[PDB]
Amino acid sequence: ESECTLRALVEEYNGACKEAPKEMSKQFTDYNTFKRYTTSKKDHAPQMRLVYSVRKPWPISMTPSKEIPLVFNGTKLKDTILDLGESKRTRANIVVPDYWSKYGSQTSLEVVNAILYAEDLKVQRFFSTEWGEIRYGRMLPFRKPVQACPTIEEVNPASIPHTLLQVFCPQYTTLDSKRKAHMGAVEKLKRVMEPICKVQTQESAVHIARSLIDSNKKWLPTVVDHTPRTAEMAHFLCSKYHYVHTNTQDIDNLCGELVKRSLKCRCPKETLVANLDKITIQGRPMREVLADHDGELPYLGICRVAMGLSTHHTMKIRSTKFSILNSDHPRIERRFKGKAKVYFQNDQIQGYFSCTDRQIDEIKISAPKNAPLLEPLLDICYYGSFIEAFLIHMGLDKDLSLPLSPELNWKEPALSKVCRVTELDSTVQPYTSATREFVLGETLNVYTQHENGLELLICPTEIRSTRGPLPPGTNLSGSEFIDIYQPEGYVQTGVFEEQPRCYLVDTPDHGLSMGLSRFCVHSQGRYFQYEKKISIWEETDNIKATIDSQRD
Amino acid sequence: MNLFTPLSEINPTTTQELLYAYTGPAPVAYGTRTRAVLENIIRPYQYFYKEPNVQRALDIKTGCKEPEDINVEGPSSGFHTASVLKLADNFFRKYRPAMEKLKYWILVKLPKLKYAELSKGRQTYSFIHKRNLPAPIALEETVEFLEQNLRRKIGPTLLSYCQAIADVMELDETTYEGARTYTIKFSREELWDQMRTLNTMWKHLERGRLNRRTIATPSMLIRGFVKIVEDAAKEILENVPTSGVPVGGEEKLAKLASKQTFHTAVTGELSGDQEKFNECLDPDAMRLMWTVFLRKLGCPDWIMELFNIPFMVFKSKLADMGEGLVYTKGKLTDRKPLGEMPSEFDDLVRNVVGNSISCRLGMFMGMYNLTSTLLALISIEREELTGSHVESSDDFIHFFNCKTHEEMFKQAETLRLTLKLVGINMSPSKCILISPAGIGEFNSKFHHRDFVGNVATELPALVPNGTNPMTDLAMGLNVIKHSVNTGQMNLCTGALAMRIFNHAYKYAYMALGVTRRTRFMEENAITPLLTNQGASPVHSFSTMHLDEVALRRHLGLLDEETLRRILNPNNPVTQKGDPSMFFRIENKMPQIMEDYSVPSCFKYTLSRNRKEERYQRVTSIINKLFPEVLIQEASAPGTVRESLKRRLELVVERSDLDEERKKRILSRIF
Amino acid sequence: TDRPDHIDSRVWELSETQEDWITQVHGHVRRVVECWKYTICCLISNMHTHRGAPQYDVFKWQDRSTIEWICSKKKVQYPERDTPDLYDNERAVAYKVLLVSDLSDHSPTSGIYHDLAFNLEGEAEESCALVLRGSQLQDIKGFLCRALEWVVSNNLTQEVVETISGEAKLQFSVGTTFRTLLKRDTDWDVIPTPRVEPNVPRIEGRRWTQMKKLPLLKEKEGPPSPWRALLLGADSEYIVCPPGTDQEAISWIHSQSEIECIRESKSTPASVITCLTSSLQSFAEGNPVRSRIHEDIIAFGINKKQEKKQSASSSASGEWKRAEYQVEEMSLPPWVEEEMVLLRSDQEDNWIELEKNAIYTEVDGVAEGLVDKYIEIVGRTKVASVIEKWQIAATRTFSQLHTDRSRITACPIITRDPSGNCQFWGMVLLGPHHVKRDTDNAPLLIAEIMGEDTEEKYPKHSVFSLKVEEKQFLLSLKITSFSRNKLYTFSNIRRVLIQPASIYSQVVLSRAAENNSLNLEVNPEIQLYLEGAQRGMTLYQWVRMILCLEFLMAIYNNPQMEGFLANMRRLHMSRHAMMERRQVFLPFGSRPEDKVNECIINNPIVAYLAKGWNSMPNVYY
RNA sequence: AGAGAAAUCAAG
RNA sequence: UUGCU
RNA sequence: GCCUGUUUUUGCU
RNA sequence: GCAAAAACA
Ligand SMILES: *O[C]1[C]([C]OP([O])(=O)OP([O])(=O)OP([O])(=O)O[C][C]2O[C](N3=[C]N([C])C4=C3N=C([N])[N]C4=O)[C]([O])[C]2[O])O[C](N2[C]=NC3=C2N=[C]N=C3[N])[C]1O[C]
């Protein structure tokens, strides 16, 4: 009953007012400080006393109870004949859990399903994946950051607290906090945690719910070409001697396909692409739809940079991918200026080449034995604008110790070998220390920041793409590009610490529905009251217009 | 060593795993630390001049010396002021985004830092009890001291804490008045001595050194000040290519691999350590570097003063001597202070303050790892050095891409001389340069063609912990899984580690042979059904990440009745002593309170052999009454009592109970 | 980024370079406040038009020359220090937006322009209310309420009020007395201002010298090192007993044995055997803990540490002087290579019976196959039996130490073969063991079956001849002292199998990776040095002796071993570099051998490793 | 005795 | 009381 | 008796 | 955030 909960909350608050005069006169915000005082929870070397602890006469400490018999079949299970009643006072043998595992009360199967749901997700995710044959070989690690575990939804870390607040305690949230939450994630997480919260405390429930939507990336060595989506099963799928091929992948592709504004925005102005991101998928604004999908798609990267965010897209030609390790000057319109080292990757093929201007200083490659090397070297030459060929530019050497053959096969014996080509020594994984400073200009070309001059473009946006299906729930109503597709709001106007003369609604939900013109909500001892909006324009377009009015 | 040096199949680097005596006992320190502390105190003064003259070097304050004063054939304690100025200027001119992010940190994160972060520390010297106390206790007592000496409330920010320290330093006399009852008094001189005091202690269970070393810990009066400096140094270090300390684990290996570009005619690799670190570096050099960084940024005077407080306090550090130097007349043993009888540390007698000894030169402590790394990194910035440097604290690796061998030797000598100008003094006997690069060492990580895996590094782990069978199993399996993912442990080694851990773990929980637990199982017809109960392992090499209970249920090894019994949320085995909150989604009553137990009956608590607990009670009642502080930072106004009372009244109001019943509930609130 | 949610991105970008926020009190907070004021100006001048031009024009955050230009188009001039935020067209009134914490009494700031004062929570002053319209008032109130909820969420109310009021406390200040205290031990001020020009001088350094030959570790000369370890190792043997419990086996041994002293050491008197017999009787009666009788004093050093003090005081003569402790140097014993030849002989049983993990995938199958291969190639080996003995003895002794007693505790060392017969390795007797710290030493009497006796190898062992059912055995009876930390470490000594398994797995998986197939039966030819030559060896024997040496290193781990291993990795890397035609260069005063030579004092396995290093070549052509 | 290594335990 | 190959 | 810093594993709030 | 454990410097 709720009466029992209310009476237990009382005389606990009252209980913490006679034996703790202080710690109540302190400010409430000070909770952020004294919540960390968990002294007497510490201990040293639990592992050095485990054995002896298990073999003590009464190792287990438990709350007194009657479901555990005093003596069972000649074995004295508990030591209840003591100074009984001191909280965790009863002492029992190590066999009491063993007794309970066979003789004990049972719960409903629904409780068992709720308790094991989070772990069962992983368990039947493991057995739902097909394993290919093991391939043994020398795979050089790439050492990239990858997501630790799969998630039910992609939610940015900024919206995670708001999503959890909407899931668990909607009555203590504001409308601004509500609009920041991921609505679909809220609904599916509510469905998931409805049975779970009956068997888990609030702290454990929030922990599980956040574990179901958090990214939590980790740095691990992977295969350069077959990068796994999640590191859940990387301990046996990949290693430095063996690999196992799997086919399991997937909205991110749909979201990237949703980017069609960049196509019909080259002519008018660059401002339109940022101005027209006023659409809302489902109830999720396009501002918040991004920062949820950190993909490698070029159009998605262009949108993310237009939002002021970063992109992980790497320049990709045909099938190879390139990354500048360092360069004196960026590529100019493309050819290099000065010394430049570039890491290239193409399936198992990988390496780095150092060049000056349009002349290759040398190339280092780590390639499988008897592997063709036509397309990677051709793509390198196209990248550097070296040849207008490859044999003439690089030259021919009489030494037979060089690995590259004139036929461009790795470690193929021949009467002569291509000079300035050497086996790699683990130069892989180009690394950037400082976060890249992406800048967007006209024509929607993404540029980074270099020490000397503007750095070369990464998203060229002249590529040849498709017109795949758009993500469900797209709402192009607030946009001038409706051709892509094949009663007012409330302002706050008031924050008080005491109940106003308004009507207090239960949640932001069950509000905005009956249509009343004045209502409060509660949040952390404050009353945020919303009334209505009589102005017929929003704030974003207002600022846009007024800054446009300040032009020269 | 001949057995550890293969010549045909594997290379000697892959056998660096075998040069580890781990799984054997670790050395420990036994007696007084006074001798080691005094050696640490006297080493900076012996290295200030080429000819050791401690008496002449004991009356210097700032360790600034002329370029020809610097020792090139041995350790050289001190620095060259002009060199530090120019090198800091060059380091600021380069790495502009790092300085921009430093400015961003100063503007945003520095005002937001809370002093409660000081609670994340370990055993801390207490200037009140003159004893090592846990960091939360020391922070709480220091805050209370500040509260009742300044007659004002301290804001949660770290800047408020530092300002409170600076203000209490002004008072002539201060009092603590703990009333655990007892009262202690201070003065400006006494409080200054307590703030400048570093407690010392032997470091135990340290592997890889023949000689035991002494560690130090400061007081809470200066830990807050050092926190800002360390945070700013970390912010700079995460954005510079030459740093190695901010990154760790696999990202550090990635950063190292990004620099192995050997393309010139001569490509050398110099891997080495730096001898006599933490005592050959003057804190005044760190002051100068930080002042230059903050002055070229355009920061005002208060930021520079705040950044200069910690190093200027450490210039006046008082290292705590131990129980005294040991003396023997015949076969007897006595402990005597430094000044009673002549010894090898008589020169330092003038520096004894009570039981503590002063040392202007050096840090005596690794309290400024990040700032010392920054100093070593600014040492590198000049046109002569064209290689790639990685420096964590005192371990460094350098890559030379030079046209000729002579140029490479010139660059190596220039690097050594720069680190000497700053005062870093790389160890000649620990620094090795390979003229064709490809074989290297950094942070106990060896690389020949890739960073080779290391076993016996994870062998100190793999021993079961002492929480409970389920927690221990999760520990072991996930530690082995991380070892396999990182690359230190392959398929065979991983599976063997699983088998060893499983066998030891089942031994620990009386599951092998004929024990009391096994006899109880057998005589009562209790089939094991679980790993800790003696059943066959369900975890495989590919299923290290899966929970035992769920996997057994999926495989049919655990029936539904046993599952309903063991996963009872009402079992007496793990019953909590207090009722707990439970959320109720889709219900008119959003929260309920009831007794709870840990679902698994095998997650019990092991007993142990035979007060600021008010804070925990306040935290518990706040958490029960305020769900939102469980997800976001607490921001409700007013004191705890009134805010909790209003929240309770609101909760009763929305309970949909009858009005007279609501009034009856409200009347009992005090 | 640092942009607040309510602040628009364009406004945040426009405010980046308006003022030098770093030099101002709460620069971030004042930047947010200026963004608030700019947004209020935006809302006031939202879209109203008068004559084809906007009703209000905003002067804030605009290029100044344009500001004077547009102000002179209307023939108006304003002071540089104070400039109105926005200007109107109908009423021809300049307006300045002000945020204040009170509206009861707000006098005009200046007579040049009037002000629009707004509270932190939305309300505007009466004149401001009447000038503007209801829509503007509601928009400003809503925006300011969003700002206020962001402020209270971040607990920035105090800073926001401080910046609004304008008192602007310095946010950090150092007083006079504290400054004087700080400047005591330095030659510079709080902010140093040296008067030396920034310059990097040219220092004449030394020259880097090539390491043309590998360093030669020095061999210590002295008496050979005895066997200094808790248990026997190679000479460890066991007595076969009928299957049963430990009590039954001990009773059988005690009832069917006779003991006669054959070799006695001054370190361990021959009388202490009585103690053992007493324990061998007490444990035979079900009581592992017995009482002192007469000989526990010598065996466990009872009532010592006080006889020595009085003896020293009686013998004290002279003046106090520094300690100057000395550690005796010892040479490589002849028994180390005999130990290595042993520990490798085959055994009847596997002695490594680890439960196999489950198999669900093919990777799992190959992993278990590799582990099974390693176990069967290192299982039937004396190292496995000695490791089992060490683990059992260490655990049985450790389990009797997490308490305080004053009586004698008996810890048997009994293993079991698959047939079930008990195997008696020895008996550990624990003294009073009033231990208070993990590193404290508890006394122990270690009896244990021995194969071969040696005066040189066991000088402190008192060997007894034990006759059990017309079978002869040798018993050790050494008096030792050992710590809880080391006993716990040796309780998990089974982990030593990982490193040789790592080597074996690396070899096998490398061979599997050369081609694209796993054989699991590869026994390649490892090329080693042996006695200075270059001769091959089979992989299995290499792994076996690696296991032997790793175990011998683990049981002899001390500061000398730790330092030697830590400092020999550089020399191992240098050797590997020189084997690949790479040159090794060193600094001026570089002698890497000295940092290794300092760790070679008396540890027999350190000396063995040093001799192994010296035997193999130092020059690589 | 012994363990041990730059000084401790071998009880209070 | 006592059973890890 | 067990500092500082950086990572990693787990569990609980 | 707290607790435990491990590695490295
Ligand atoms: O420290 C800690 C953190 C970590 O992470 P970072 O990154 O650093 O940060 P972030 O994440 O971003 O933040 P968040 O988390 O989101 O939030 C903050 C806030 O809120 C709170 N919380 C949180 N959470 C999660 C939680 C809480 N509380 C409770 N009771 N529980 C939970 O869970 C906090 O306090 C604040 O105020 O972060 C955090 N965290 C994480 N995790 C955790 C935490 N805390 C606690 N617990 C946990 N488990 C912290 O901060 C402070």
Residues B270 and B394 in one domain: yes
- B461 located within any domain: no
Q: Are A142 and B600 in contact (CB under 8 A)?
A: no
Q: Which tokens hold the place of B266?
A: 């001569």
Within 13 Å and on the Cβ side, how many CA atoms surround A423? 11
C421 touches strand E (CB under 7 A): no
Q: How far apart are CA C342 and CA C348, in angstroms?
A: 15
Distance to chain B for C257, nearest Cα, Å? 27
d(CA C543, CA C375): 11
Residues in B closer than 8 angstroms to A106, CB to CB, are 561, 564-565, 568
Element (DSSP H or E) covering residue A32: helix A31-34
- Token pair in block for residue C500: 């040789």
Q: Is the CB of B212 under 7 A from strand D?
A: yes
Q: Is residue A79 part of a domain?
A: yes
> Please, which residues bridge with residue A317 across strands?
A320
Phi, psi of C100 (to 5 degrees): -135, 160
Could you tell me the strand order of the sheet in which C321-322 lies? B334-336, B325-328, C321-322
C300 touches strand D (CB under 7 A): yes
Residue C299, number of CB atoms within 10 A of its CB: 24
Nearest to B367 by CA among B208, B200, B209, B239: B200
Domain co-membership, B544 together with B598 = no
Residues A295 and A360 in one domain: no
The residue type found at C310 is Q
CB A170 within 8 A of CB A507: yes
Structure's resolution in angstroms: 2.7
Domain contains A379: yes
Token pair recorded at residue B61? 């304050």
Number of H helices, E strands in chain C: 20, 18
Work out whether strand C94-99 and strand C114-118 pair parallel, antiparallel, or are unpaired.
parallel
Q: How far is the CA of C266 from the C1' of D1 (A)?
A: 9
- DSSP bridge partners of B396: B272, B391
Element (H, E) at B591: strand B591-594
In a domain, A146, yes or no: no
**Domain contains B67:** yes
Same domain assignment for residues A443 and A519 = no
Partners of residue A231 in chain B, C-beta under 8 Å: 485
Residues in chain C: 621
- Strands A421-423 and A359-366 come out as parallel
Q: Is residue B457 part of a domain?
A: no
The Å distance, CA of A204 to C1' of F13, is: 8
Q: What CA–CA distance (Å, rounded) separates C288 from C282?
A: 6
- Bridge partners of C525? C538
CB atoms under 10 Å from CB of A222, counted, come to 21
Per-residue 3-state assignment (H helix, E strand, C coil) for B132-173: EECHHHHHHHHHHHHHHHHCCCCCCEHHHHHHHHHHHCCCCE
State which of A465, A482, A499 marks the end of a domain: A482
E strand spans, C147-257: 209-210, 239-241
From the C1' of F9, which residue's alpha carbon is nearest? B479
A12-17 contacts: CB < 8 A, separation 24 or more?
A12/B621, A12/B624, A13/B621, A13/B625, A13/B644, A13/B645, A13/B648, A13/B669, A14/B668, A14/B669, A14/B670, A15/B617, A16/B614, A16/B617, A16/B618, A16/B621, A17/B641, A17/B670
Contact across the interface for C498 and B89, Cβ inside 8 Å: no
In C407-556, where do the E strands start and end?
408-416, 422-430, 441-450, 464-468, 471-475, 478-483, 525-528, 535-538
H or E stretch at C71 = helix C64-73
Residue burial C583-607, b: 16+ Cβ < 10 Å; e: rest: ebbbbeebebbebbbebbbbbbbbb
Say how far apart CA C512 and CA C522 lie, in whole Å. Answer: 9
Alpha-carbon distance values, A131 to A128, A135, A248, B539, C509 (Å): 10, 12, 10, 18, 20
3-state secondary structure of A233: coil
Whether residue B188 is found in the same domain as residue B297: no
Chains touching B by CB (3 or more pairs below 8 Å): A, C
Q: Does C303 touch chain B (CB under 8 A)?
A: no
Count the neighbouring beta carbons within 10 Å of the beta carbon of residue A260: 16
B300 contacts in chain C (CB < 8 Å): 22-23
Using C1' positions and the CA of B518, the closest nucleotide is E3
Q: Is residue B462 part of a domain?
A: no
Of A74, A101, A128, which residue constitutes the final position of a domain?
A: A101
Give chain B's radius of gyration (CA, Å). Answer: 30
Structure letter (DSSP) for residue A26? S
Taking the alpha carbons at both ends of chain C, their separation in whole angstroms is 59
For residues A542 and A451, state if they share a domain: no
| DSSP label at residue C609 | H
Find tokens 């001189």 and name the residue.
Answer: B189
**B291 inside 8 A of chain C by CB:** yes
- Residue in the structure block whose two tokens are 């570089």: C590
Asked if B575's CB is within 8 angstroms of A65's CB, the reply is yes
How far is the first Cα of chain A from the last one, in angstroms, to the nearest whole number?
Answer: 69
Say yes or no for a CB contact (<8 Å) between A493 and C155.
no
Residue B66 distance to chain A (closest CA, Å): 35
Q: Does the residue A11 lie in any domain?
A: yes
Backbone angles phi, psi at B173, to 5 degrees: -135, 140
Give the chain B residue whose CA is nearest to the CA of C528: B6
Q: Are C564 and C605 in contact (CB under 8 A)?
A: no
Of the candidates B549, B568, B645, the beta carbon closest to that of A106 is on B568
In contact, B327 and B345? CB cutoff 8 Å? no
Experimental method: cryo-EM
Report yes or no: C81 at the B interface, CB cutoff 8 Å. no
Rounded Cα gap, residues B23 and C553, in angstroms: 10
Amino acid present at A540: T
> Is the CB atom of residue A201 positioned under 7 angstroms from any atom of strand G?
no
Interface test with B, best of C495, C568, C581, C600 (most B CBs within 10 A): C495
Give the C-alpha distances (Å, rounded to integers) separating B45 from B77, B235, C88, C392: 8, 33, 73, 52
Residues A91 and A32 in one domain: yes
- Alpha carbon distance A220, A229 (integer Å): 12
Indicate the helix (H) or strand (E) that contains C164. Answer: helix C157-165
Q: How crowded is residue B669: how many other Cβ atoms within 10 Å of its Cβ?
A: 16
Give the separation between CA A250 and CA A253, rounded to whole angstroms: 9
A121: CB partners within 8 A, 6+ apart: none
Same domain as B233, residue B290: yes
Nearest alpha-carbon partner for C336 in C556, C110, C513: C556
Same domain for B361 and B324: yes
Nearest CA-CA distance, residue A373 and chain C, Å: 20
Q: What residue type is assigned to position A186 of the chain?
A: V
Using an 8 Å CB-CB cutoff, list chain A residues near B526: 98-99, 101-102
- What string of H, E and C letters represents the secondary structure of C375-430? HHHHCCEHHHHHHHHHHHHHHHHHCCCCCCCCCEEEEEEEEECCCCCEEEEEEEEE
In a domain, A149, yes or no: no
Residue A351 · residue A332 · CB < 8 Å: no
In chain C, % helix, strand, coil (3-state, to 5) comes to 40, 15, 45
Per the DSSP assignment, residues forming a β-bridge with C409 are C289, C430
Atom 24 in ligand 1: residue holding the nearest Cα: B631
- Domain boundary (A423, A449, A469) is at A423
Q: Tokens for A502, please give them.
A: 């308004």
Q: Give the burial string for B636-668 (b: 16+ CB within 10 Å, else e).
A: bbeebbebbbbbbebbbebbebeeeebeebeee
**C328 Cβ contacts chain D strand, under 7 Å:** yes
**Coil, helix or strand at residue B309:** helix
Shared domain check, B219 and B111? yes
Domain that holds residue B652: 580-667
Nearest by CB to B601, which of A16, A97, A437? A97
From B528, B562, B596, the end of a domain falls on B562
User: Under DSSP, is residue B220 helix (H, G, I), strand (E, B) or coil?
Assistant: helix
Q: Looking at the CA of residue A160, tell me the nearest atom of ligand 1.
A: 16
- C178 neighbors B170 (Cβ within 8 angstroms): yes
Q: What atom of ligand 1 comes closest to residue A203's alpha carbon?
A: 31
Look up residue A21 and give its two tokens. Answer: 């005069």
Q: How far is A493 from chain B (nearest CA, A)?
A: 19
Domain boundary among B198, B226, B254: B226
Same domain, B493 and B642: no
Largest Cα span, chain A: 97
- B85 and B234 assigned to the same domain: yes
| Cβ pairs bridging A and C (under 8 Å) | 133
- Which residues, other chains included, contact C341 with Cβ-Cβ below 8 Å and sequence gap of 6+? none
Residue B120 DSSP symbol: G
Question: Phi and psi of C90, rounded to 5°?
Answer: -70, -60
Place of tokens 């972060």: B117
Residues B290 and B422 in one domain: yes
Rounded CA separation B123/B134 (Å): 5
Residues 492-551 of B with CB under 8 A from C: 492-500, 502-504, 514, 536-543
**CA A202, A204, A206, A208: dihedral to nearest 10 degrees?**
-150
B593 and B646 assigned to the same domain: yes
Residue B458 lies in a domain: no
Task: Write b or e for each residue in B107-128: b if 16 or more Cβ atoms lie within 10 A of its Cβ, otherwise e.
Answer: beebbebbbbbbbebeebbbbb
Let me know if residue A304 belongs to a domain. Answer: yes
Domain stop point among B534, B562, B590 = B562
Mutate to test the pocket of ligand 1, among A37, A206, A217 (most ligand atoms within 8 A of CB): A206
HSE-CB at C104 with a 13 A cutoff on CA atoms is 1
Distance from CA of C75 to the nearest CA of B (A): 39
**Is residue A125 in some structural domain?**
no
Q: Do residues A288 and A333 both lie within one domain?
A: no
Cα–Cα distance between C565 and C369 in angstroms, integer?
32
CB C85 within 8 A of CB C58: yes
Nucleotides of F under 7 A from a protein CB: 1-13
Q: Which residues have C-beta within 8 Å of that of residue A390, sequence separation ≥ 6?
A: A377, A378, A381, A408
> Token match 């070229």: residue?
B296
Which bases in strand D are touched by protein, i.e. have an atom under 7 Å from a CB? 1-12
Task: Specify which residues B391 forms β-bridges with.
Answer: B243, B396
Task: Clarify whether residues A321 and A306 are in a common domain.
Answer: no
Do the Cβ atoms of B318 and B357 come closer than 8 Å? Answer: yes
How many Å lie between the centroid of ligand 1 and the Cα of residue B633? 8
Which pair of structure tokens corresponds to residue A440?
Answer: 């967007």
Same domain, A548 and A471: no
Contact partners, residue B180, CB within 8 Å, separation at least 6: none
Residue ranges of domains in chain C, CATH in brackets: 9-165 (3.40.91.90), 236-302+392-491 (no CATH)
Interface check for C305 against chain B (CB to CB < 8 A): the answer is no
| Residue A274 shares a structural domain with residue A298 | yes
Q: For residues A119 and A211, give the distance between their C-alpha atoms in angstroms, rounded to a whole number.
A: 12
Chain C residues with CB-CB distance to B424 below 8 A: none
Both B275 and B406 in one domain: the answer is yes
Residues A351 and A263 in one domain: no
Taking an 8 Å cut-off on Cβ atoms, the answer to whether C142 and A491 are in contact is yes
First-residue to last-residue Cα distance in chain B: 77
Domain assignment present for A63: yes
The answer to whether the C-beta of B516 is closer than 7 A to strand E is yes
- Give the structural domain span for A529: 487-552
Residue B464 lies in a domain: no
Q: What strands lie across the sheet with A495-496, from one edge to the other? A: A495-496, A526-530, A519-523, A503-504
Whether C246 and C273 have beta carbons less than 8 Å apart is answered as no
Distance CA B315, CA B286 (A): 11
Backbone φ and ψ of B286, nearest 5°: -65, -40
Q: For chain A, how many structural domains are there in total?
A: 4
CA B434 to C1' F11, whole Å: 46
- C-alpha to C-alpha distance for C517 and C515, rounded to whole angstroms: 6
- Are both B380 and B281 inside the same structural domain? yes
Residue B652 within any structural domain of the chain: yes
Cα torsion C344, C350, C352, C355 to 10°: value is: 160
| Nucleotides of chain G touched by protein CB (<7 A) | 1-9
| Residue whose structure tokens are 């809880």 | C484
Between CA A222 and CA A170 the distance in angstroms is: 41
Q: Please give the distance, rounded to the nearest whole angstrom, from the Cα atom of residue A180 to the centre of ligand 1.
A: 18
DSSP per-residue letters across B275-294: TTTTTSS-HHHHHHHHHHHH
Residue pair B147/B232 in contact (Cβ under 8 Å)? The answer is no
Cβ-nearest to B21 among C323, C561, C570: C561
- CA-to-C1' span, C462 to D10 (A): 21
Let me know if residue B588 belongs to a domain. Answer: yes
Distance C271 CA to D8 C1' (A): 29
Which amino acid makes up residue C505? Answer: S
Q: How far is the CA of C301 from the C1' of D10 (A)?
A: 6
Please report, for residues A195, B16, C267, C307, the alpha-carbon distance to residue C310 in angstroms, rounded to integers and kept in the order given. 75, 51, 21, 5
* Domains: count for chain B: 4
Tell me how close the Cα of B473 comes to any Cα of chain A, in angstroms: 13
Residues with CB under 6 A from ligand 1: A 32, 157, 161, 206-207; B 630, 632-633
